[PDB]
């Protein structure tokens, strides 16, 4: 169970260990002896291109639309009250049509699916083009999410409920920086692990680690302050 | 204030030294697929005799060097005087 695995990867450590790298090319190279069908079917590697911005925007919109459809299915449609006459007309349509339930679900989920698609695409474009070059990553995430969710709640829920949307955006940005951007509960390397270069002798490395341990003994408050009894 | 305090570290850039070789060595592990492709290209080119002149490993080498220097160039630049990010942005 991981979040943003490809972006949160120590490529140097992965290469040193020989672990497979998600940044390795995921593509197909046909030879000049393959059939035309092999040439065409090898073009599906374009769907694996994470640097194709059109594909990324489309997939972000698809994820947002899926979230919107799920919200409508579970919390949205059941919450609101459809007029009785409208429901009777819809059920009459279902009676007289062979697949009327699919049409009903298309009509009901269309506003939520469209809103989710638009929100996902706009959010991806906003984050990718406006905030991907900021120095303070946490502050950029918090500000971007705050503004985006304030605008979204001002137009999707109610313009009066925009302070709450801004606060929720701040909280969501903090959560996103904590888990989607940081490797918390998703560590891929041991804490304190390192790699060695320079072809230093083992005796030299042992001496350096002894020196480090001597410095490490200064981190104890009893040792540093000289508050130890003679054992 | 921090600016009024002495500096606790002296990097190679601040000593007037070039860390390019070390950063290349430490960014080579980031790019091993391209290095293996380049090695395969060299092995295949050494295999045959008087190959077509329009058959070079300069393109695998270009891919490998692009991958490696994508790691070594920005980092060193981040350590240079006059490369500060700015007061606000």
């Amino acid at each position: 169970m991981e979040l943003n695995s490809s972006a949160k990867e120590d490529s140097h450590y992965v290469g040193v260990l020989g672990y497979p790298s998600q940044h390795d090319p995921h593509t197909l190279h046909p030879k000049k002896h393959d059939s035309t069908f092999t040439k065409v079917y090898a073009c599906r590697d374009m769907l694996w291109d994470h640097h194709w911005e059109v594909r990324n925007t489309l997939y972000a919109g698809f994820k947002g639309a899926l979230l919107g459809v799920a919200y409508a299915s579970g919390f949205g449609l059941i919450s609101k009250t459809v007029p009785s006459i409208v429901l009777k007309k819809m059920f009459r349509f279902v009676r007289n049509n062979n697949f009327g339930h699919i049409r009903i679900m298309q009509d009901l989920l269309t506003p939520y699916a469209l809103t989710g698609f638009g929100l996902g695409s706009v959010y991806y474009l906003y984050q990718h083009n406006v905030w991907e070059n900021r120095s303070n990553k946490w502050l950029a995430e918090v500000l971007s999410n705050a503004l985006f969710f304030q605008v979204a709640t001002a137009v999707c829920v109610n313009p009066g409920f925009h302070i709450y949307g801004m606060v929720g955006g701040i909280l969501f940005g903090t959560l996103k920086y904590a888990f989607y951007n940081s490797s918390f509960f998703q560590e891929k390397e041991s804490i304190g692990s390192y790699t060695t270069f320079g072809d230093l002798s083992e005796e030299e490395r042992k001496k350096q680690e002894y020196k480090d341990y001597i410095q490490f003994l200064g981190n104890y408050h009893k040792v540093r302050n000289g508050q130890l009894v003679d054992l | 204030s921090s600016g009024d305090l002495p500096s606790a570290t002296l990097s190679m850039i601040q000593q007037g030294q070039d860390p390019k070789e070390l950063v290349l060595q430490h960014c080579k592990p980031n790019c091993l697929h391209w290095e293996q492709k380049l090695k395969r290209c060299e092995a295949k080119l050494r295999e045959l005799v008087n190959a077509d002149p329009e058959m070079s490993c300069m393109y695998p080498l270009r891919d490998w060097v692009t991958c490696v220097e994508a790691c070594v160039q920005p980092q060193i630049i981040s350590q240079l005087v006059g490369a500060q990010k700015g007061r606000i942005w």
């Binding site: 593509t27 | 300069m58 692009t66 160039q73 630049i77």
Partner: peptide, 30 residues
């Protein structure tokens, strides 16, 4: 309307396959 970016041609511009052109702008960011 899509370009491979692994053939040495940045964004479909196919005149500079004989040199390293991406570093600092597309591959990395100086």
């Amino acid at each position: 309307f899509i370009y491979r970016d692994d053939i040495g041609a940045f964004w479909g511009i196919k005149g500079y396959e004989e040199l390293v052109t991406e570093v600092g702008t597309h591959k990395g960011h100086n």
